[PDB]
């Protein structure tokens, strides 16, 4: 990520009892509250996409916030799966919600002094919705959530099909093993649109970036770009309108015409929200 010399980035091995393996975590300490930077659909096992593609660590150096980049979890949606992914030979069950909400914060509190409460969850593409869902169900841990080009209504219309095809294109993962058939309650449970009343009741500070142009990680679905763009626009508009109609009053919604679904503009948003996170989490 082309950091300037002299920056204290660490790589940690954090045991996950629920997944029966160690999870690598890239870490920069800087204060008791942290920004959890979640990865996209094609998350690798060596480095988090934020560190591969952006200067996130340097941008948040001496911000008064710690930065946590978990590594791994391709196509996981940072959720707890029903079962090991059926077809690609996965030999354990993804339990990334358990890891992010229980196992990892316990480790970081005991060893780093990072507070398990009062943090920000920031996700993009696959994990944009994850960040909102984490805030919806764990508001003490995440009073702040940002979704950058997230799937804001994964249980509706075209989205279960498109997500299923995207997960197969990203490591051959099976959405059915994750949340069941699209009729299963897990799809609505993990749908940010459906959980808007929780975000409102929690008074979650939400930062929602809506990009333009060709969506990301949908490259293998054999569908015209403009159709995907139309679906995305409609779903994003519905999310914003529903948040307002349901009494939401703690949101930032960003829809710049030249914004794209890409690391450069996801970084642009991460930088733009820094003062916002600082004021909300640290006064």
Curated annotation (Swiss-Prot):
EC number: 2.3.1.122, 2.3.1.20
Inactivation phenotype: Cells lacking this gene transfer 40% fewer mycolates to the cell wall with no change in the types of mycolates esterified to arabinogalactan or in the composition of non-covalently linked mycolates. As a consequence, the diffusion of hydrophobic chenodeoxycholate and of hydrophilic glycerol through the cell envelope occurs much more rapidly in mutant cells than in wild-type.
Gene Ontology molecular functions: acyltransferase activity, transferring groups other than amino-acyl groups; diacylglycerol O-acyltransferase activity; trehalose O-mycolyltransferase activity; zymogen binding
GO cellular-component term (any): peptidoglycan-based cell wall
Keywords: Acyltransferase, Secreted, Signal, Transferase
Presence of the UniProt keyword Methyltransferase in the record: no
Summary of subunit composition and partner proteins: Homodimer.
Biological role: The antigen 85 proteins (FbpA, FbpB, FbpC) are responsible for the high affinity of mycobacteria to fibronectin, a large adhesive glycoprotein, which facilitates the attachment of M.tuberculosis to murine alveolar macrophages (AMs). They also help to maintain the integrity of the cell wall by catalyzing the transfer of mycolic acids to cell wall arabinogalactan and through the synthesis of alpha,alpha-trehalose dimycolate (TDM, cord factor).
UniProt keyword Transcription present: no
Additional notes on this entry: Was identified as a high-confidence drug target.
Catalytic activity field: an acyl-CoA + a 1,2-diacyl-sn-glycerol = a triacyl-sn-glycerol + CoA; 2 alpha,alpha'-trehalose 6-mycolate = alpha,alpha'-trehalose 6,6'-bismycolate + alpha,alpha-trehalose
Organism: Mycobacterium tuberculosis (strain ATCC 25618 / H37Rv)
Protein name, per record: Diacylglycerol acyltransferase/mycolyltransferase Ag85C
Any single GO BP term: mycolate cell wall layer assembly
Residues of the full protein shown: 46 to 328 of 340
Subcellular compartments: Secreted
Record-listed substrate binding positions: 41-42, 125, 153, 231-234, 238, 261-263
Family listed: Belongs to the mycobacterial A85 antigen family.
Active site: 125 (nucleophile), 229, 261
Activity regulation note: Inhibited by 6-azido-6-deoxy-alpha,alpha-trehalose (ADT).
Coiled-coil intervals: none
């Amino acid at each position: 990520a082309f950091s300037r010399p002299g920056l204290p980035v660490e790589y940690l091995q954090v045991p996950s009892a629920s997944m029966g393996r160690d999870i690598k975590v890239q870490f920069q300490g800087g204060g008791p509250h942290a920004v959890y930077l979640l990865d996209g659909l094609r998350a690798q096992d060596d480095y988090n996409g934020w560190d591969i593609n952006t200067p996130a660590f340097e941008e948040y150096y001496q911000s008064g916030l710690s930065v946590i980049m978990p590594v791994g979890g391709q196509s996981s949606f940072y959720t707890d799966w029903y079962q090991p992914s059926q077809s690609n030979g996965q030999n354990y069950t993804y339990k990334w919600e358990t890891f992010l909400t229980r196992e990892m914060p316990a480790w970081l509190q005991a060893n780093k002094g990072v507070s398990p409460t009062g943090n920000a969850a920031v996700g993009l593409s696959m994990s944009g919705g994850s960040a909102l869902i984490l805030a919806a169900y764990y508001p003490q841990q995440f009073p702040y959530a940002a979704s950058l080009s997230g799937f804001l209504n994964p249980s509706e219309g075209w989205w279960p099909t498109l997500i299923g095809l995207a997960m197969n294109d990203s490591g051959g993962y099976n959405a059915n093993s994750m949340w069941g058939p699209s009729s299963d309650p897990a799809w609505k449970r993990n749908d940010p649109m459906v959980q808007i009343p929780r975000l409102v009741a929690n008074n979650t500070r939400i930062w929602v970036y809506c990009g333009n142009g060709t969506p990301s990680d949908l490259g293998g679905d054999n569908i015209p770009a403009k159709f995907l763009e139309g679906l995305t626009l409609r779903t994003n508009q519905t999310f914003r309108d529903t948040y307002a109609a349901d009494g939401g009053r703690n949101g930032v919604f960003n829809f710049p015409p030249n914004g794209t679904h890409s690391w450069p503009y996801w970084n642009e948003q991460l930088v733009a929200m820094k003062a916002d996170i600082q004021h909300v989490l640290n006064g």
